[PDB]
Amino acid sequence: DCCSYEDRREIRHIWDDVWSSSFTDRRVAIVRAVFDDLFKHYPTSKALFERVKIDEPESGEFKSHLVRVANGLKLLINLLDDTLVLQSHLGHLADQHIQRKGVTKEYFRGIGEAFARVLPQVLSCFNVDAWNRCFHRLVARIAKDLP
Amino acid sequence: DCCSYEDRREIRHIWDDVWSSSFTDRRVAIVRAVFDDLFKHYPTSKALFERVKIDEPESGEFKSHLVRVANGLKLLINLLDDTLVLQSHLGHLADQHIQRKGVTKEYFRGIGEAFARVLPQVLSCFNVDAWNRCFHRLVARIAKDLP
Amino acid sequence: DCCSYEDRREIRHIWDDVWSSSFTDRRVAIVRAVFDDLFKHYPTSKALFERVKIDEPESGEFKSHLVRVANGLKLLINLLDDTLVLQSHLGHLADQHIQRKGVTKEYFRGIGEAFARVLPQVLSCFNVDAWNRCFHRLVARIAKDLP
Amino acid sequence: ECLVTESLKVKLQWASAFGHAHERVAFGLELWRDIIDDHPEIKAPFSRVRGDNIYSPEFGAHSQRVLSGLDITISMLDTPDMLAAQLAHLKVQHVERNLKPEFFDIFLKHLLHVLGDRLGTHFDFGAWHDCVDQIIDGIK
Amino acid sequence: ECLVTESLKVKLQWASAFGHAHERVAFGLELWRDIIDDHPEIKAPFSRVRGDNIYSPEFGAHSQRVLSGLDITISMLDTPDMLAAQLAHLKVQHVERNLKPEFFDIFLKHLLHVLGDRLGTHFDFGAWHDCVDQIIDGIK
Amino acid sequence: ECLVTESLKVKLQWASAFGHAHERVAFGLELWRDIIDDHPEIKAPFSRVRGDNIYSPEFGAHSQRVLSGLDITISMLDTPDMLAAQLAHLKVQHVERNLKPEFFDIFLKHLLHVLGDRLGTHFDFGAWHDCVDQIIDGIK
Amino acid sequence: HEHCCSEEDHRIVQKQWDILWRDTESSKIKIGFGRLLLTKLAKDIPEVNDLFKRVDIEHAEGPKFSAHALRILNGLDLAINLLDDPPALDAALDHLAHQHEVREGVQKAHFKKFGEILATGLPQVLDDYDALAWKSCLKGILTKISSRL
Amino acid sequence: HEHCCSEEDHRIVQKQWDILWRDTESSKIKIGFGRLLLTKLAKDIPEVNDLFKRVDIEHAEGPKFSAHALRILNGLDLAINLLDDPPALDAALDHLAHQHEVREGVQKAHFKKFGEILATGLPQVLDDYDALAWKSCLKGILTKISSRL
Amino acid sequence: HEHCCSEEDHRIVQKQWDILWRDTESSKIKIGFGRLLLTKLAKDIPEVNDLFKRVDIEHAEGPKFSAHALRILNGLDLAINLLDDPPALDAALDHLAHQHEVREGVQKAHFKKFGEILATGLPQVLDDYDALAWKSCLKGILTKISSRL
Amino acid sequence: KKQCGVLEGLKVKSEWGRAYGSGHDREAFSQAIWRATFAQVPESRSLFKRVHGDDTSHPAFIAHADRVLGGLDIAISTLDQPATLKEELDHLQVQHEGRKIPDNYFDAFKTAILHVVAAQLGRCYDREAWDACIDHIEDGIKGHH
Amino acid sequence: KKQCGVLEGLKVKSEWGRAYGSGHDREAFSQAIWRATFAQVPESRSLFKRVHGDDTSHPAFIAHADRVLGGLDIAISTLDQPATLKEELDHLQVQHEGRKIPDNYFDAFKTAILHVVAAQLGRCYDREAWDACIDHIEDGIKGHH
Amino acid sequence: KKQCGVLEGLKVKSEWGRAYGSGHDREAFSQAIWRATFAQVPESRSLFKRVHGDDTSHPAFIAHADRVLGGLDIAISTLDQPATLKEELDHLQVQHEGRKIPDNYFDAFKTAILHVVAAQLGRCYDREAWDACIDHIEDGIKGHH
Ligand code: HEM
Ligand code: HEM
Ligand code: HEM
Ligand code: HEM
Ligand code: HEM
Ligand code: HEM
Ligand code: HEM
């Protein structure tokens, strides 16, 4: 259950296919689906997003937030090969979430389940196992002091 | 009668052989021969070159004029692969000749005929057809507003 | 007895093996052995090194003197392919030795013999002939005005 | 003023120049080195991210965070609703720090310079300038 | 003072550093970017040729005209009669613009620097400096 | 303050960046071109070694001597007795020349810059800075 | 005339064109670019706005004109993608010619203007652009589409 | 757990480790680095000083502790060089495990700290360091050596 | 084989010399360089001016001296181009040897000076110059031509 | 078995992108689909006499086949933009109304698309997602349920 | 015939560096030495029963063999640091004292080392230098003259 | 058929450069010309007895042939410098006056040069320009019309 070098390389290939275009449509919609999944399984999490306007899901402030998450994840994937920079940034992402009261270890487990349910729907020949292994390793660090 | 990509490439190889040495002798002599041809077929054109001293054809002012023409042509050839720069520069060369009252389309037809007669005498395996296509295209733009 | 291009290239290969680590231990010991050899064959030369404290052979000022010689030789080897720089620098090295009265052509012959006898003991497959040929050429110049 | 073709040009050119994993890292470092070289005062606000050592993993992370930010804004040049919100968000992150607005101009001079090296003579300076200028104004 | 060996050296080294089609275009751009980076006043006289955007085709055309000009003078280093005439001609073309004579000095400084990059340690700085200096003086 | 790990990092990284035959010559030229470009006063003390022409064999020789000297000190970072003696020896060789102590700071600034180019994002800036700073101080 | 949109010419065009679809939101690019081209055409020749009444050019951002923008962009894409098969291309350009023939008001002058607008706009999006190759290839395509007008 | 210190993981570790012996004065490097690690270990857990009384940690620079610094570094070098041969590795780590088992005071807590010190230290000497691959591989090794504790 | 103007030596010399004739106005280069060399020779050893009276060194730029400069330069070109064929080189250098032998005044000392002038001037035209290879190859050639003096 | 929702529309767009290709690959891709259709419903061939359907290598048939995939391309590319898609599908429906095309044929064509795409991408394709999305596109061209 | 002095210690250090290798090469090297030892004194094998000496491919034996070369490595690497070498050789001596290892064996071992190294390095090795330095290392392990 | 004018001299200078080559190619080239000469006028061979004309592989003969092409190289290179050419041609004429060389021989030599050059460059040469310029050069060596 450790994120191997092979896993990390496997994820790099996968990632080229979800994160295509330099337009936002694809990366708004996937992350939107991931969150819909999150809110379906942990509905109390929906309240953490009022400041970015979930109440107006097509608002632009909400869509830009979706893109920020997308790019955040894209940053993480593109760091899977610079492990010391990764280690450092992971701490930064952790501090951003610690500073949002209500964000818990459970919700991060839930976003994990959301990605594993959704990603296989956007691309085929997806190696969900490698993905989960690395995603859990990333989430482990981000959520270390959250609950 | 368009100047194809193959033609432009053909002209590059041709041009390596005429435009050798970083000495002026060869490029003084070829261009001198081109103009002798022009003057033989369009004698009234000779009157346009008094300021650069045709009257003293070994003068240095006239020889430098011949090199400027040589290098102008060298510039055009070396722009055959940078078509937007080429397009812009071509107008510049046009303006220099429009400010010379007396320069006509007919004379540019003549210099074309002169190159076609002279080049095949300075190098063998010369593709005169490819040369003519491209040289006409160049001259067409240079002499657009000349007549 | 000229230093050929093949000899110079041979010496480069040799040199990678004597001049390893970026620690001084190895390049202290080899040059110390070279000097021990010199002092055995030309004992009066030993008096030229009182300023760098031979009397205290482990002093650090003497050990650093040994490294300066080591690096001076490394300098020469690494110039064997920049012959004009080499020529210039060789004079510089000559001038440094001319300013030490007592340094003779004979002692420089001796250091050549010392290297020839010592290098084969620190590495096998050492081309002593190629080494001597080039070392003699280098020495010839360093000691031109010494005697 | 960044019209349709220029935004499109910037996106396409950014795709090449940005690169991927470690290609990003080297880009970001080269940029900040150029900037801090030209203007040592800029290290002061980077106190928390080790601006004194741009080769450290802490600054490497900040650098990556920045390029990822540039990347969001470039991908949003054609969606004004989102661009407005995102630029607002970025401004918030810069606004309580003694940042002279001209720091961002220096940032642009150097971004264009480094992008110039990467893309060469094909570099659409006109487009980049118009386009990124807008992103800078929204943060500045 | 450019003797016979030096002019020959410059001719030869120029042949390599100059290059051909696109290699010339990239050389020229790198040159002017360096110059205008170091002295932004120099954009002012380049107003008619888009000096504000050296990546434009208008300025690329101007750039190419300059290198082709340098080419003429380098190739005339051994014919004083022709060189005198060409330098006079180039001077006419520069004389009515508010060009400070030091502009050409800055030009030479950067020409030598960019040439250095292309040619490396083999670059005959002495020969170049002597040789092009005379050219610069004839136009200055 | 160069601990054991840092001196070792510098040793290892020097081995790569330094190179061998002609690689060193190119390194030295790039370094001194950068320095002298930035601070043309530094040519004055180089009167005897043709500082006016860094591409000359005379300056190349000087340049090689310098790098070889740097090499000696780097290889001595772990032997204080030797380092002390060597730095004293080097100081003797600079003391009687009108060298502002800041010359060595400029040298360092450019050394770390060129080293950064050669080594990339792996350059242990912190280790180098610490380690060579000490060397600089001993000669300064 | 074998030197007009030659073998290498059309190969250059196809390579340079392909570059626009490196990424997956090609529709976005097609619509933006096509919309820009026709909008510019309507600006320079006002009568064109009437010609595109059926497709609601009045609301260039609307679904109607978006679909149209795609249809035209895919038309040009079709021609470019068939440049390496002259007889198939001719069949396709003939079909396009008929499609423009049955439209009243559409004239050869419009196709000349479009070609200019097109030669200007392509380099603004493609950072690799052989003006000469594109010009000869676009002319052949534009002429065949407007021969029936 | 075939993804903990995987094939490529240990191959990365071996390649990166190897760079440290690019040169011949490896003993100098081994002694320096080994001494540093254990010195740091004792600093953090003072009881460790007693554990190394026999190897004269008191005079870290002395020939006694120097030899020991080499013994441990080669111990770690042995494990790394056997990563590509799991059963041989296990035999090797089991042997080390006994050697520490027979030392009173040495505990798992010590090996956890050492792992940390080692993770911090390695990148200070290797300019190419996969933190993830080293972490998983070092854990496997450190755990096997400390199980009999 | 054998270390003086060795195999690689003469190959370095030939490659480096060849650079001079990259361009077609090689007469211009041969005349300029040869004139420079002999002129410098006469400057250093004034008696040399007398040796070249028959070729009008008095008018260095003249057609007489020019032809001669081509002649010597082609003589040196001949030797260099025969370096990869030692016995043909010897025949050529021996022929040159005879030709100088029949000129009274021409002496070994002149050829030693020429070698120095040649060593100084060559790097001034060639930006790639192995001083060691040229030195040994030039020496063999100059010695052979001047042996009959 | 699956509806052409957001995620399946997404996947089909990408996979279509990868399979569609350009130049000679695209011509081959177009022919492979029409041959697969004809193999399943040889009756349909008679519909394409005007466009030389008798010979799938004929340049007029290549043009027609590229034109078809041109239209399909628009539809797939706008799966995530329903208003634009509806507009395109209406345009296609108008071009097909009057022609006697039984469901039987749209059905074979869909099977062909899926068969050729599956070959084009090997494993990396989702058949149910393609099936749902081609269905949705064909519904709009038929005008039928 | 030659003493383990500065120069010969320096040589052996380099040549060991080159022969020793890593990973699979090191395992093979480790094995080659023991097999040559056993080929010369098959008697000695009985001492290694606790470490599967009967089978030189057994993992437990590889570990042992690598462990041996591990000790040899420390010794060779500190030939130039007498005090450290002494401390290492004493540690080893303590681990061999008690065992019945006749000179006969150390002698065969030395011959194996030299044999396998000469193979690894071809020409580029000095038999006399190695012989001296291995002798010197072995004296400290035996404790005997 | 054509005179050695400015343009023909220009062409011959370039084609000579390309055909002349260097190193082993130049030797082979030198020999090809002399063999072609001898094949055409075998009588002429006897003139070269002092320089081993009986064996064209002999080093003394190569040297001689390289020497001849060296003279020709000077002449061709200065076709554009009449004053210099004349001076070279006079030098050569002095070296040939005395020797009994019939026009017949200069004639075969010219044919041989043209023949070998034609082969060296394949299509890319102008026989009429070469013929004219070699004639011009030979007129100065003969001293005859
Ligand atoms: C292959 C040869 C040699 C090299 C590369 C060499 C190199 C050097 C170098 C780099 C220095 C330091 C100069 C400075 O920075 O002050 C030096 C100093 C010196 N060398 Fe040599 N050397 C060589 C042979 C000799 C020989 C044969 C002798 C005579 C026995 C000699 C006697 C000295 C002396 C007396 C000093 C000055 C010591 C002092 O007072 O600091 N060297 N040498
Ligand atoms: C490079 C060129 C062009 C291509 C490839 C092209 C292609 C097309 C295509 C594929 C259609 C839709 C046909 C259909 O399926 O019904 C179309 C429609 C049309 N085109 Fe073009 N076209 C081009 C240039 C122009 C220009 C210059 C005009 C200007 C008068 C023009 C005017 C129209 C009009 C008026 C329609 C009908 C719009 C409607 O009501 O649906 N086209 N064109
Ligand atoms: C990565 C890990 C380690 C390796 C590879 C390692 C290896 C070794 C080796 C090869 C020896 C010498 C065995 C012999 O007698 O021949 C040794 C001894 C020892 N080790 Fe470790 N060790 C490691 C970590 C530690 C740690 C974390 C501790 C802290 C409690 C430790 C405490 C000792 C002690 C106390 C001795 C005995 C020292 C003595 O000779 O008195 N080791 N170890
Ligand atoms: C590397 C060297 C040299 C080469 C290859 C060389 C070659 C030649 C050649 C090919 C000729 C013309 C032979 C003929 O066709 O009659 C010549 C003539 C001559 N050379 Fe040299 N030469 C060399 C160096 C010198 C030097 C150093 C001297 C100075 C003493 C010298 C003095 C002469 C003289 C006096 C003539 C006769 C000039 C005349 O025609 O009156 N040469 N040499
Ligand atoms: C899902 C798919 C389909 C798409 C996207 C599609 C698209 C098209 C397009 C773009 C045209 C050309 C319109 C024009 O420019 O004139 C076309 C024509 C046509 N289609 Fe389809 N079509 C589809 C399915 C079918 C099926 C299943 C059939 C019957 C087997 C069919 C029969 C025809 C016929 C007969 C023509 C006219 C050919 C001609 O010009 O003579 N289509 N279709
Ligand atoms: C030059 C040589 C030698 C070196 C450097 C050497 C080194 C070692 C080392 C490092 C160990 C493992 C210590 C431990 O962790 O338990 C070892 C164990 C041993 N050695 Fe040696 N040794 C050498 C020669 C020999 C010879 C010649 C023999 C007799 C044939 C021998 C017999 C043993 C035995 C029997 C063991 C114990 C195996 C076991 O654990 O069951 N050694 N030696
Ligand atoms: C276009 C033509 C020719 C050129 C450029 C030419 C040039 C030369 C040159 C440069 C030499 C050497 C002078 C020296 O250094 O001693 C030479 C020698 C000679 N040439 Fe020619 N030559 C030409 C044609 C001929 C022809 C056609 C013949 C008669 C078949 C001929 C017969 C000789 C002989 C007999 C020698 C002297 C051989 C010896 O040294 O024993 N040449 N020529």
Domain of residue G83, CATH code: 1.10.490.10
C-alpha–C-alpha distance, residues E16 and E20, integer Å? 9
Q: Return the number of other C-beta atoms located less than 10 Å from residue G128's C-beta.
A: 10
Q: How many CA atoms lie within 13 A of J34 on its CB side?
A: 27
What DSSP state is assigned to residue I96? H
The three-point CA angle F34-F40-F45 to 5° equals 105
Q: Do chains K and J touch (3 or more CB pairs under 8 A)?
A: no
CB D139 within 8 A of CB D19: no
> Which atom of ligand 7 approaches the CA of L67 most closely?
10
With CA atoms as reference, the chain G residue closest to A18 would be G24
CB contact set of H27 (below 8 Å; sequence gap of 6+): H70, K74, K77, K78, K81, K84
Question: What beta strand segments (E) does chain E contain?
Answer: none
CB F91 within 8 A of CB F23: no
C-alpha–C-alpha distance, residues K77 and H28, integer Å? 9
Amino acid at L22: S
With CA atoms as reference, the chain L residue closest to I17 would be L22
CB C29 within 8 A of CB K13: no
CB A136 within 8 A of CB A1: yes
C-alpha–C-alpha distance, residues A98 and A70, integer Å? 19
C-alpha–C-alpha distance, residues L10 and B118, integer Å? 11
CB I100 within 8 A of CB I146: yes
C-alpha–C-alpha distance, residues A74 and A71, integer Å? 5
Q: How far from chain centre, in Å, is Cα D21?
A: 17
Q: Label residues J93-131 b or e (16+ Cβ within 10 Å = b).
A: eeeeeeeeeeeebbbbbbbbbbbbbbebbeebbbeebbb
Q: Return the number of other C-beta atoms located less than 10 Å from residue E93's C-beta.
A: 12
CB D8 within 8 A of CB D109: no
CB-based contact B124 L6, cutoff 8 Å: no
Residues in chain C, how many?
Answer: 147
C-alpha–C-alpha distance, residues G25 and E35, integer Å? 40
CB I100 within 8 A of CB I149: yes
C-alpha–C-alpha distance, residues I144 and I100, integer Å? 11
C-alpha–C-alpha distance, residues A14 and A20, integer Å? 11
Nearest CA to ligand 6 atom 33: K96
Q: Supply φ then ψ for residue A51, to 5 degrees.
A: -65, -30
Nearest CA to CA, how far is G67 from chain A (Å)?
18
For residue A31, which of A143, A122, A127, A109 has the smallest C-alpha distance? A122
In the numeric block, which tokens belong to residue C57? 């052979």
CB I22 within 8 A of CB I92: no
Q: How many domains does chain B have?
A: 1
CB-based contact C20 H25, cutoff 8 Å: yes
Q: How far from chain centre, in Å, is Cα H118?
A: 7
Nearest CA to CA, how far is B20 from chain L (Å)?
9
C-alpha–C-alpha distance, residues C69 and C19, integer Å? 13
D3 Ramachandran zone, left/alpha/beta (phi>0; psi -120 to 50): beta
In the numeric block, which tokens belong to residue G48? 């064109």
CB C123 within 8 A of CB K15: no
C-alpha–C-alpha distance, residues G141 and G138, integer Å? 5
Q: Which of residues 32-51 of G touch D (CB under 8 A)?
A: 32-33, 35-36
The alpha carbons of chain L give a radius of gyration, in whole angstroms, of 14
Tokens 């260097």 correspond to: L22
Amino acid at A105: K
Judged on CB neighbours under 10 Å (0-12, 13-18, 19+), L123 is: exposed
- CA of C70 from ligand 1 middle (Å) equals 10
Q: Give a three-class secondary structure readout of chain A.
A: CCCCHHHHHHHHHHHHHHCCCCCCHHHHHHHHHHHHHHHHHCHHHHHHHCCCCCCCCCCCHHHHHHHHHHHHHHHHHCCCCCHHHHHHHHHHHHHHHHCCCCCCHHHHHHHHHHHHHHHHHHCCCCCHHHHHHHHHHHHHHHCCCCC
J1-145: which CATH number, 1.10.490.10, 3.40.30.10, 1.20.1560.10, 3.30.470.10?
1.10.490.10
C-alpha–C-alpha distance, residues L88 and E4, integer Å? 23
In the numeric block, which tokens belong to residue K57? 């491919």
CB contact set of K29 (below 8 Å; sequence gap of 6+): K19, K20, K21, K69, K116, K120
CB L144 within 8 A of CB L103: yes
Chains in touch with A (≥3 Cβ pairs < 8 A): D, G, H, J
What are the residue ranges spanned by the domains of chain D?
1-140
- CA of H20 from ligand 6 middle (Å) equals 27
Enumerate residues lining ligand 1, CB below 6 A: C 45, 48-49, 51-52, 65, 68-69, 72-73, 96-97, 100, 103, 107-108, 111
C-alpha–C-alpha distance, residues B112 and B131, integer Å? 10
- CA of J113 from ligand 5 middle (Å) equals 14
Q: Tell whether ligand 4 has an atom less than 6 A from the beta carbon of residue I108.
A: no
In the numeric block, which tokens belong to residue B104? 């006509």
Q: How far from chain centre, in Å, is Cα A118?
A: 11
In the numeric block, which tokens belong to residue K31? 């094995």
CB-based contact G81 J78, cutoff 8 Å: no
In the numeric block, which tokens belong to residue G38? 């026709």
Q: Tell whether ligand 4 has an atom less than 6 A from the beta carbon of residue I54.
A: yes
CB contact set of H86 (below 8 Å; sequence gap of 6+): none
DSSP 3-state of I148: coil
Q: Tell whether ligand 4 has an atom less than 6 A from the beta carbon of residue I111.
A: yes
Q: How many CA atoms lie within 13 A of H41 on its CB side?
A: 27
CB K8 within 8 A of CB K135: no
C-alpha–C-alpha distance, residues H110 and G2, integer Å? 82
Q: Do chains B and E touch (3 or more CB pairs under 8 A)?
A: yes
In the numeric block, which tokens belong to residue D42? 């800029």
Contact with chain E for residue D34, Cβ under 8 A: no
C-alpha–C-alpha distance, residues E24 and E16, integer Å? 11
Q: Supply φ then ψ for residue A23, to 5 degrees.
A: -115, 165
H or E segment to which residue D86 belongs: helix D80-94
CB contact set of K138 (below 8 Å; sequence gap of 6+): K106, K109, K110
Q: Tell whether ligand 7 has an atom less than 6 A from the beta carbon of residue L62.
A: no
Contact with chain I for residue E20, Cβ under 8 A: no
Q: Label residues A97-108 b or e (16+ Cβ within 10 Å = b).
A: beeeeebbeebb
CB K142 within 8 A of CB K100: no
What are the binding residues of G for heme b? 100
Tokens 């050893």 correspond to: I45
CB A4 within 8 A of CB H8: yes
What DSSP state is assigned to residue I47? T
For residue D129, which of C65, I74, K63, E54 has the smallest C-alpha distance? E54
C-alpha–C-alpha distance, residues K86 and K64, integer Å? 22
CB J104 within 8 A of CB J41: yes
C-alpha–C-alpha distance, residues H71 and K71, integer Å? 8
Residues in chain J, how many?
Answer: 145
CB D18 within 8 A of CB D135: no
Tokens 């010359």 correspond to: F103
User: What does each C-alpha distance from I19 to C78, C147, F1 come to in angstroms?
Assistant: 26, 42, 52
Judged on CB neighbours under 10 Å (0-12, 13-18, 19+), K86 is: middle
In the numeric block, which tokens belong to residue E72? 């003429």
Tokens 């300066």 correspond to: C68
CB C89 within 8 A of CB C137: no
C-alpha–C-alpha distance, residues L26 and J7, integer Å? 73
C-alpha–C-alpha distance, residues D134 and D78, integer Å? 12
C-alpha–C-alpha distance, residues B46 and B62, integer Å? 12
Q: Return the number of other C-beta atoms located less than 10 Å from residue B48's C-beta.
A: 16
CB K40 within 8 A of CB K112: yes
What DSSP state is assigned to residue B49? G
User: What does each C-alpha distance from B125 to A144, B77, B131, F115, L102 come to in angstroms?
Assistant: 77, 18, 12, 52, 36
CB B91 within 8 A of CB B141: yes
Nearest CA to CA, how far is D34 from chain E (Å)?
13
Amino acid at B36: D
The three-point CA angle A107-A109-A110 to 5° equals 60
Name every chain H residue with its beta carbon within 8 A of the beta carbon of C21.
23-25, 28
CB-based contact C25 H23, cutoff 8 Å: no
Mutate to test the pocket of ligand 2, among G74, G81, G99, G110 (most ligand atoms within 8 A of CB): G99
In the numeric block, which tokens belong to residue J77? 């590319």
DSSP 3-state of E2: coil
C-alpha–C-alpha distance, residues G79 and G84, integer Å? 10
DSSP 3-state of G14: helix
CB B42 within 8 A of CB B108: no
DSSP 3-state of A59: coil
C-alpha–C-alpha distance, residues J127 and J133, integer Å? 10
For residue F113, which of F94, F100, F132 has the smallest C-alpha distance? F132
CB-based contact B1 G136, cutoff 8 Å: no
Nearest CA to CA, how far is E42 from chain F (Å)?
20
Q: Return the number of other C-beta atoms located less than 10 Å from residue L38's C-beta.
A: 17
Range of the domain at I71: 1-149
For residue J19, which of J35, J33, J38 has the smallest C-alpha distance? J33
Nearest CA to ligand 3 atom 14: H99
D4-18 and D57-75 helices, crossing angle to 10°: 150
CB-based contact F20 C74, cutoff 8 Å: no
Name every chain J residue with its beta carbon within 8 A of the beta carbon of A17.
14
C-alpha–C-alpha distance, residues K31 and B143, integer Å? 86
Q: Label residues F46-73 b or e (16+ Cβ within 10 Å = b).
A: beebbbebbbbbbbbbbbbbebbbbbbb
C-alpha–C-alpha distance, residues G79 and G88, integer Å? 9
C-alpha–C-alpha distance, residues L118 and L12, integer Å? 12
CB contact set of C129 (below 8 Å; sequence gap of 6+): none
Q: How many CA atoms lie within 13 A of K29 on its CB side?
A: 26
Tokens 């899926």 correspond to: J114
Chains in touch with B (≥3 Cβ pairs < 8 A): E, G, I, L
**What is the per-residue DSSP string for H47-114?**
THHHHTTTTTGGGTTSHHHHHHHHHHHHHHHHHHHTTT-HHHHHHHHHHHHHHHHTSTT--HHHHHHH
Q: Return the number of other C-beta atoms located less than 10 Å from residue A69's C-beta.
A: 17
How are the residues of chain K apportioned to helix, strand and coil, as percentages rounded to the nearest 5?
75, 0, 25
Contact with chain D for residue F116, Cβ under 8 A: yes
H or E segment to which residue H43 belongs: helix H26-44
Name every chain I residue with its beta carbon within 8 A of the beta carbon of E13.
127
CB A54 within 8 A of CB A46: yes
CB A31 within 8 A of CB A19: no
Domain of residue B48, CATH code: 1.10.490.10
User: What does each C-alpha distance from I3 to C8, C134, I133 come to in angstroms?
Assistant: 11, 10, 10
Range of the domain at B99: 1-147
Amino acid at L76: I
CB contact set of L85 (below 8 Å; sequence gap of 6+): L75, L78, L79, L137, L140
Q: Give a three-class secondary structure readout of L102-140.
A: CHHHHHHHHHHHHHHHHHHHCCCCCHHHHHHHHHHHHHH
> Which atom of ligand 7 approaches the CA of L41 most closely?
30
For residue G67, which of F111, C67, J93 has the smallest C-alpha distance? J93
Q: Tell whether ligand 2 has an atom less than 6 A from the beta carbon of residue G93.
A: no
Q: How far from chain centre, in Å, is Cα I112?
A: 11
For residue H124, which of F118, F125, A90 has the smallest C-alpha distance? F125
Q: How far from chain centre, in Å, is Cα K84?
A: 18
CB J82 within 8 A of CB J89: no
Nearest to I125 among E5, E122, E123 (CB): E5
Enumerate residues lining ligand 3, CB below 6 A: H 48, 51-52, 54-55, 68, 71-72, 75-76, 96, 99-100, 103, 106, 110-111, 114, 142, 145
- CA of G6 from ligand 2 middle (Å) equals 26
Amino acid at G30: K
CB-based contact F75 C22, cutoff 8 Å: yes
CB B38 within 8 A of CB B45: yes
Reported CATH class of domain D1-140 = mainly alpha
C-alpha–C-alpha distance, residues G44 and G118, integer Å? 13
CB D16 within 8 A of CB D25: no
Question: What beta strand segments (E) does D12-80 contain?
Answer: none
Q: Tell whether ligand 2 has an atom less than 6 A from the beta carbon of residue G71.
A: yes
C-alpha–C-alpha distance, residues C52 and C48, integer Å? 9
**List of long-range contacts for J81-86, beta carbons under 8 Å, 24+ apart:** J81/G27, J81/G63, J81/G66, J83/G63, J84/G63, J84/G66, J84/G67, J84/G70, J85/J140, J86/G63, J86/J140
Q: How was this structure determined?
A: X-ray
